[PDB]
Amino acid sequence: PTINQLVRKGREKVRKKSKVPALKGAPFRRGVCTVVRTVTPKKPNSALRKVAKVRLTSGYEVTAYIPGEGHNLQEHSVVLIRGGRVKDLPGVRYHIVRGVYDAAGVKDRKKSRSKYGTKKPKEA
Amino acid sequence: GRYIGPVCRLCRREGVKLYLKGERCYSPKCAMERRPYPPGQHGQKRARRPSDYAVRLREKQKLRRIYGISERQFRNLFEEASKKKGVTGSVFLGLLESRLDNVVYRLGFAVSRRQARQLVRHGHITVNGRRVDLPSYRVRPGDEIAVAEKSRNLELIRQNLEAMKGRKVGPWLSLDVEGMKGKFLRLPDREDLALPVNEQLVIEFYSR
Amino acid sequence: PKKVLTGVVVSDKMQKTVTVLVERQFPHPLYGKVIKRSKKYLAHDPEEKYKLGDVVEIIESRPISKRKRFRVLRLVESGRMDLVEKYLIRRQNYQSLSKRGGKA
Amino acid sequence: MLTDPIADMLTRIRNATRVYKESTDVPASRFKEEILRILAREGFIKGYERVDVDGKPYLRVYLKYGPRRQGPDPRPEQVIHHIRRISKPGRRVYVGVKEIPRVRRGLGIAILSTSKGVLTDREARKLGVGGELICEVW
Amino acid sequence: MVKIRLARFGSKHNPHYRIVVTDARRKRDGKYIEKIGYYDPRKTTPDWLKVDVERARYWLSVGAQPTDTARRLLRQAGVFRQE
Amino acid sequence: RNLSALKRHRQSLKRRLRNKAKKSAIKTLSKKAIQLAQEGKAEEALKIMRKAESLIDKAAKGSTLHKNAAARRKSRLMRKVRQLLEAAGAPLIGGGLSA
RNA sequence: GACUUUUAAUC
RNA sequence: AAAA
RNA sequence: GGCUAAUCCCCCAUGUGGACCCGCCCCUUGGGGUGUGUCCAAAGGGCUUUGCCCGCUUCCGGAUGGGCCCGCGUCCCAUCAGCUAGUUGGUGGGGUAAUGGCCCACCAAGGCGACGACGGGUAGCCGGUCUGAGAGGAUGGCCGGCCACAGGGGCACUGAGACACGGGCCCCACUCCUACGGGAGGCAGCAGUUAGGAAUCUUCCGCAAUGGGCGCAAGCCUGACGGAGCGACGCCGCUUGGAGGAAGAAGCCCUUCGGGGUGUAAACUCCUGAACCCGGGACGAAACCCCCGACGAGGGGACUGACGGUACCGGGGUAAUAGCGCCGGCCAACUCCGUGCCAGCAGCCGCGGUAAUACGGAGGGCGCGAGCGUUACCCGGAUUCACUGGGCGUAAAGGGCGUGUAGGCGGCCUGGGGCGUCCCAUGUGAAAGACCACGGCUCAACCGUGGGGGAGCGUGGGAUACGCUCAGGCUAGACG
Ligand SMILES: [Mg+2]
Ligand SMILES: [Mg+2]
Ligand SMILES: [Mg+2]
Ligand SMILES: [Mg+2]
Ligand SMILES: [Mg+2]
Ligand SMILES: [Mg+2]
Ligand SMILES: [Mg+2]
Ligand SMILES: [Mg+2]
Ligand SMILES: [Mg+2]
Ligand SMILES: [Mg+2]
Ligand SMILES: [Mg+2]
Ligand SMILES: [Mg+2]
Ligand SMILES: [Mg+2]
Ligand SMILES: [Mg+2]
Ligand SMILES: [Mg+2]
Ligand SMILES: [Mg+2]
Ligand SMILES: [Mg+2]
Ligand SMILES: [Mg+2]
Ligand SMILES: [Mg+2]
Ligand SMILES: [Mg+2]
Ligand SMILES: [Mg+2]
Ligand SMILES: [Mg+2]
Ligand SMILES: [Mg+2]
Ligand SMILES: [Mg+2]
Ligand SMILES: [Mg+2]
Ligand SMILES: [Mg+2]
Ligand SMILES: [Mg+2]
Ligand SMILES: [Mg+2]
Ligand SMILES: [Mg+2]
Ligand SMILES: [Mg+2]
Ligand SMILES: [Mg+2]
Ligand SMILES: [Mg+2]
Ligand SMILES: [Mg+2]
Ligand SMILES: [Mg+2]
Ligand SMILES: [Mg+2]
Ligand SMILES: [Mg+2]
Ligand SMILES: [Mg+2]
Ligand SMILES: [Mg+2]
Ligand SMILES: [Mg+2]
Ligand SMILES: [Mg+2]
Ligand SMILES: [Mg+2]
Ligand SMILES: [Mg+2]
Ligand SMILES: [Mg+2]
Ligand SMILES: [Mg+2]
Ligand SMILES: [Mg+2]
Ligand SMILES: [Mg+2]
Ligand SMILES: [Zn+2]
């Protein structure tokens, strides 16, 4: 662009677009389970991925992944969404935080416990 | 809580003799003797060429594991060095050397920096007269580091300052085994130190 | 110091008042090239003395009406519509850019 | 019509030296002449002289090159490696004496035009006056 | 009414005031008109009080009214000593 | 509750009424004078203009009018009165006006 | 269950 | 037919 | 309805002076002087009572604070292009401390816009903050300056000052009282409740210090403030030991009931002594006031701390929290067992289909450590909106071609101006912050003192090469 052109139009400042309309750009959003289906992966994977249709307090109704070995979520349990997609399931852009509200932690867990929210086991 | 755990193991991983015990790290047992290979189930196994990164990460870990400083403190002393005018490399070493714990060690009042550190936190050391219980305290030039009068009578300080008779002290320092005094003369020039560390790489570790 | 500006008269159509077009010139904050911007000021002419095309000095003054804070200091050079012209044409080009197409 | 002569001249020189011409003409102008004066003094060129062509005032610019070289491509090193217009119509570039550039840690020059006349950045700093930064040469 | 008073600049348990000329109505630590000294109640250095008698006198001459402590301190610095 | 400083309200009201009273008279006499003036009655026109003047200054004594407000008043009065007597009046008492 | 390296499909 |  | 005081209200007087009108001047917008005529003052109180204190009146000036005006700068959308009637200007009037369509009547037909008017979205602005080599980008919580608001809307009264958070009036919504006529309210003050939310504290102590209001003063008021409290929310300091010294109860240690190293690490010996106990125990506070001196300068004396019996000093004294993430590559750190495209992992590339350094466990290792990790958001890397610093034949990108308006750009020589440009001096750039030096708390964080730089803009003076402008000339561009 000639300088004159630059002086007439300038450069467009590129704006960013969120991957997590968890609204209020909060770090988390509380929600409620509407459904607790199972979903199959894409690209080159196979399994019965566990998901949840959460009714957001931010006025949204999104689906969220349920990390961990096994869960205990029913068609009415309160839950905290956290942001972070699941590469294998297009459309799933949030995870449920294990250990908060009606979502139990992950029993039998031993390592990445802070994640999965599981209290420190006693080494008596 | 500056580490607090197996130490002759760090000498091992660093593949170099680190004197993190003063005594014993001389008598056929620093472990770096007849077992100079890293610790753990794979310590002996064949080693693959490290990444320019690893080489830089170990060098820093070496230099820091010597003084006992935490990354938090280490990093900050480095940033202060960086900011100041004068070859960061050396200046950093100089600031590391000015730490009271280390100075108390250079003067022999204690045999290891760890012991040295404890001797400061327990009020057995003094500076220009008033006692200072801060390992991180920074000694300036002209400062006198004595021994807590009420502590000059401890079996630990006796042995040590006794073994000091005959021992020479670093050119930037000077001591009087008599009244158990010692004087910080100047910041040790890089040349005055014989550290098993190439601080140029340390600097690079923080460039990335 | 009361600001003093020079410009051309582009309108005597008012009573005791004239419009002075003042040219400003300067380096663009980021792109550097000297750019020329302009602005019309409604100066006070107590004796409907100044006419179109007259280059006049304008002096910062005591408010005389909403939108009118200047008085004609003096006349620099009488006559020279060439400037007034540029202005009028630029004004006429306007009837065009819209829902159709005027003149060129 | 030439849109920017100082640039045309600068370029003519850039071009002529790249093929190793010996002479090289360029329409004459007081200003163009003043710049040449500096080029000659700083020793980027073997000098220059006024001339006529088809009956018009030109400036023969005698070019200068290093010596023949070894290996393939025995072409002389260039005396004028770089030479670029800085200020241009459609973005004139001015500078304060405090804003005069140090072209290539000194191994190069910068010709600026001041109210005290045309002069290398060195000279400009001397008299302590900036102006329109004309070209750059190293 | 313009005054000469003490403004708080130290820190918790470490008070340090600035002897200052200001309008009677501004925050204690607001925008003052001029600094004319400073003071350390705990005298932690051989320089815990300093004043610009020349300036102090200026404001007093144009109507500035000092606080009680302001005066106390100004007096120490010999602002009214005519002797 | 009751912040005894309701008194300021009580006081304001009296003051209000007090101010209102003074200004009313000023206007009335002002017109008054402007009236006789717009009729040539020079003697009694100035007479009153003179009271108006007095009242105004007095009003500006306390804080009713007060200021240059008073001065505008007088000015605007000694203005019209004198200009309306530009009808052959010939300032008789020439009381206020310094012809 | 069988085939395939697993799986779909197929018997 | 899908994955490698 | 009746009585009454004053520093409450009014009248007459004196007029230093001041205000207004008209001139018998200088200045230059309404500044200053002058003269005639009008016009305008005051409050008393206390004593150590014939003096002194507090206060009153008019005027000139200082200081401080503030109103108003102007140049320049200040986000996104042109899928917003035309907008405007008090609207632009004029005369007269009103209004105000004051200029002004500020408001009004009358006349005029103007004013604004592509250099983006009008409309829509978003938003308090700044010192600064974070980031970046820089240019720049993002931001404006804490602290400091300015603005705005005080349940939503409108209005004015009183004042030097308000159109007034804890003043007034009306309308509206809501709460409360109600003998249903009618009334009381406004935490965006401190604290606290409740609701919303992923989420944000004590219905604390004190007026001792600093500051403020009133008072001659004693002193009263001060949820401003000075402190303590709760929360690893942040930053800094510190501890869980130091020096010696290589063995393994019912041990998860390759469990259809299939046993690798950790590591001087432990044990254990010797030493110091976090907690904790006893004793002492602070600066912050010397003024106001009283006495001498003249209520002055100066000197003398006394009263007074929430924090707190806290910091700090001395004495005694116990070996006494460790966790969290990661180990396929990017990226520092590897093996066994379980599982078998399942269960699960995953920042990107990808991993799991019976021998998985990638899943879950275990041993081992790496990283950091009273923290560690996750999610969100900003700058960076990203020369990936490219001014510095990018591109368009085939990668995304030349308009289907022309004509042409505005605009941008402009050959050679001389001269005037000096707008751009450059230079010198000078003013402005509050403080805090940032940088450097020194200093106070044992260090540091933190804080104190001092120092230095700075673009932009104003003023005065100067330069004239280039750009510009005016004037003249040229013929190499262009046209004939
Ligand atoms: Mg797969
Ligand atoms: Mg994992
Ligand atoms: Mg009262
Ligand atoms: Mg097959
Ligand atoms: Mg199968
Ligand atoms: Mg597959
Ligand atoms: Mg009655
Ligand atoms: Mg009287
Ligand atoms: Mg009175
Ligand atoms: Mg808003
Ligand atoms: Mg960059
Ligand atoms: Mg309101
Ligand atoms: Mg509210
Ligand atoms: Mg008042
Ligand atoms: Mg009033
Ligand atoms: Mg208001
Ligand atoms: Mg309130
Ligand atoms: Mg509250
Ligand atoms: Mg809730
Ligand atoms: Mg007080
Ligand atoms: Mg009270
Ligand atoms: Mg407070
Ligand atoms: Mg040990
Ligand atoms: Mg004291
Ligand atoms: Mg008191
Ligand atoms: Mg005294
Ligand atoms: Mg990995
Ligand atoms: Mg690796
Ligand atoms: Mg396996
Ligand atoms: Mg594994
Ligand atoms: Mg810490
Ligand atoms: Mg960029
Ligand atoms: Mg991008
Ligand atoms: Mg570019
Ligand atoms: Mg590109
Ligand atoms: Mg293409
Ligand atoms: Mg084409
Ligand atoms: Mg095309
Ligand atoms: Mg054109
Ligand atoms: Mg030209
Ligand atoms: Mg100029
Ligand atoms: Mg300056
Ligand atoms: Mg500053
Ligand atoms: Mg210090
Ligand atoms: Mg000249
Ligand atoms: Mg010509
Ligand atoms: Zn060792």
Nucleotides of I under 7 A from a protein CB: 9-11, 18-22, 29, 35-42, 58, 62-65, 68-74, 76-77, 81-82, 88-91, 93-102, 108-115, 135-138, 143-146, 157-162, 164, 166-168, 185, 196-199, 209-213, 224-228, 236-246, 260-265, 270-274, 283-288, 296-298, 314-315, 319, 321-326, 330-335, 341-353, 360-379, 385-387, 390-391, 404-414, 419-424, 430, 435-437, 439-444, 446-450, 455, 458-460, 462-467, 476-477
B46: left (phi over 0), alpha (psi -120 to 50) or beta: beta
Which run of H or E residues covers position C85?
helix C81-93
Rounded distance, CA A21 to CA A29, Å?
A: 10
DSSP secondary structure string for all residues of D13-69: HHHHHHTT-S----B--HHHHHHHHHHHHHTSEEEEEEEEETTEEEEEEEE-B----
Minimum-distance residue to I37 (CA–C1'): F98
The domain spanning residue C26 has which CATH number? 2.40.50.140
User: What residues of D are in contact with residue A4 (Cβ under 8 Å)?
Assistant: 90
The sign of the dihedral angle between the CA atoms of A62, A68, A69, A72 is: negative
3-class SS string, A11-45? CCCCCCCCCCCCCCCCCCEEEEEEECCEECCCCCC
Please answer whether residues D6 and D84 qualify as being in contact, where contact means their C-beta atoms are separated by less than 8 angstroms: no
Q: Best residue in A2, A5, A6 to probe C by mutation, most C CBs within 10 Å? A: A6
DSSP secondary structure string for all residues of F37-57: HTTT-HHHHHHHHHHHHHHHH
Rounded distance, CA B172 to CA B188, Å?
A: 5
Distance of CA B58 to the CA centre of its chain: 17
Cα-trace Rg, chain B:
18
Please answer whether residues E73 and E37 qualify as being in contact, where contact means their C-beta atoms are separated by less than 8 angstroms: yes
What stretch(es) of chain D map to CATH 3.30.1370.30?
Answer: 3-80
Question: In 3D, which of A93, A98, A104 has the Cα closest to residue A56?
Answer: A93
| Phi, then psi, of C69 in degrees rounded to 5 | -125, 35
Q: State both tokens at E21.
A: 């000329």
DSSP secondary structure string for all residues of F41-97: -HHHHHHHHHHHHHHHHHHTTTTSS-SHHHHHHHHHHHHHHHHHTTTTT--SS--S-
Closest C1' nucleotide to C30's CA: I387
Query: Cα–Cα distances in Å, from A36 out to A92, B94, B196?
Result: 13, 62, 60
| Phi, then psi, of B115 in degrees rounded to 5 | -65, -45
B30 is in an annotated binding site: yes
Which run of H or E residues covers position E67?
none
CATH class of D3-80: alpha beta
Cα-trace Rg, chain A:
20
Structural domain boundaries enclosing C23: 1-104
3-class SS string, chain B? CCCCCCCHHHHHHCCCCCCCCCCCCCCCCCCCCCCCCCCCCCCCCCCCCCCHHHHHHHHHHHHHHHHCCCHHHHHHHHHHHHHCCCCHHHHHHHHHHCEHHHHHHHCCCCCCHHHHHHHHHCCCEEECCEECCCCCCECCCCCEEEECHHHCCCHHHHHHHHHCCCCCCCCCCCEECCCCEEECCCCCCHHHCCCCCCHHHHHHHCCC
| Phi, then psi, of D124 in degrees rounded to 5 | -60, -45
Distance of CA D129 to the CA centre of its chain: 20
Chain F residues 6-35 with Cβ under 7 Å of strand I are 6, 8-9, 11-13, 15-16, 18-20, 22
Give the length of chain B.
Answer: 208
Rounded distance, CA F96 to CA F30, Å?
A: 13
Q: How far is the CA of E20 from the centre of ligand 30 (A)?
A: 70
| Phi, then psi, of B149 in degrees rounded to 5 | -40, -50
Chain C residues 25-54 with Cβ under 7 Å of strand I are 25-27, 29-34, 36-42, 44
Asked if D90 has any chain A CB less than 8 Å from its own CB, the reply is yes
Which of B160-198 are b and which e, b meaning 16 or more Cβ less than 10 Å from the residue's Cβ? bbeebeeeebeebbebebeebebbbeebbeeebbeeebe
Rounded distance, CA C22 to CA C42, Å?
A: 11
Distance from CA of A3 to the nearest CA of D (A): 7
Please answer whether residues E58 and E36 qualify as being in contact, where contact means their C-beta atoms are separated by less than 8 angstroms: no
Cα–Cα–Cα angle for F66, F72, F76, nearest 5°?
A: 140
Distance from CA of D107 to the nearest CA of A (A): 31
CATH code reported for the domain at D81-138:
3.30.1490.10
The sign of the dihedral angle between the CA atoms of B135, B139, B145, B148 is: negative
Helices (H) and strands (E) counted in chain D, each on its own, are: 3, 7
Q: State both tokens at D44.
A: 């980027």
Compare all CA atoms of chain C with the CA of D89 and give the residue at the minimum distance.
C33
Rounded distance, CA B158 to CA C38, Å?
A: 89
3-class SS string, A64-123? EECCCCCCCCCCCCEEEECCCCCCCCCCCCCEECCCCCCCCCCCCCCCCCCCCCCCCCCC
| Phi, then psi, of D41 in degrees rounded to 5 | -60, -45
Q: Which domains does chain B have, with CATH numbers?
A: 1-96+194-208 (1.10.1050.10), 97-193 (3.10.290.10)
Query: Chain C: which residues have CB within 8 Å of chain D?
Result: 27, 31-34
Please answer whether residues D61 and D45 qualify as being in contact, where contact means their C-beta atoms are separated by less than 8 angstroms: yes
Q: CA(A30)–C1'(I193) in Å?
A: 24
Question: In 3D, which of A33, A24, A97 has the Cα closest to residue A61?
Answer: A33
Q: State both tokens at E7.
A: 């403004």
The amino acid present at D125, given as its one-letter code, is R
Q: Which domains does chain E have, with CATH numbers?
A: 1-83 (3.30.1320.10)
Asked if A2 has any chain C CB less than 8 Å from its own CB, the reply is no
Label the pairing between strands E2-8 and E65-66. Answer: parallel
Rounded distance, CA B147 to CA B169, Å?
A: 17
Rounded distance, CA F45 to CA E66, Å?
A: 57
What stretch(es) of chain D map to CATH 3.30.1490.10?
Answer: 81-138
End-to-end Cα, chain C, rounded Å: 43
Strands (E), chain C: 4-14, 17-27, 34-44, 55-60, 70-77
Rounded distance, CA C35 to CA C30, Å?
A: 11
Rounded distance, CA D128 to CA D30, Å?
A: 24
Asked if D89 has any chain A CB less than 8 Å from its own CB, the reply is no
The amino acid present at F95, given as its one-letter code, is G
Residues A1-124: name the CATH superfamily: Nucleic acid-binding proteins (2.40.50.140)
Experimental approach taken: X-ray
Q: How many domains does chain F have?
A: 1
Q: State both tokens at F34.
A: 């402007």
Compare all CA atoms of chain A with the CA of C30 and give the residue at the minimum distance.
A7
Q: How far is the CA of D103 from the centre of ligand 40 (A)?
A: 28
F22: left (phi over 0), alpha (psi -120 to 50) or beta: alpha
Cα-trace Rg, chain D:
16
Distance from CA of C26 to the nearest CA of D (A): 11
Chain A residues 73-92 with Cβ under 7 Å of strand I are 80, 82-89
Three-state secondary-structure class, residue C55:
strand
| Phi, then psi, of B132 in degrees rounded to 5 | -130, 120
The domain spanning residue F25 has which CATH number? 1.20.58.110
Please count the other Cβ atoms lying within 10 Å of the Cβ belonging to residue E56: 24
Give the CA dihedral B129, B134, B140, B142, nearest 10 degrees: 20
Label the pairing between strands A29-35 and E49-51. Answer: unpaired
**Contact, E83 CB vs strand I, < 7 Å:** yes
Resolution to 1 decimal, in Å? 3.0
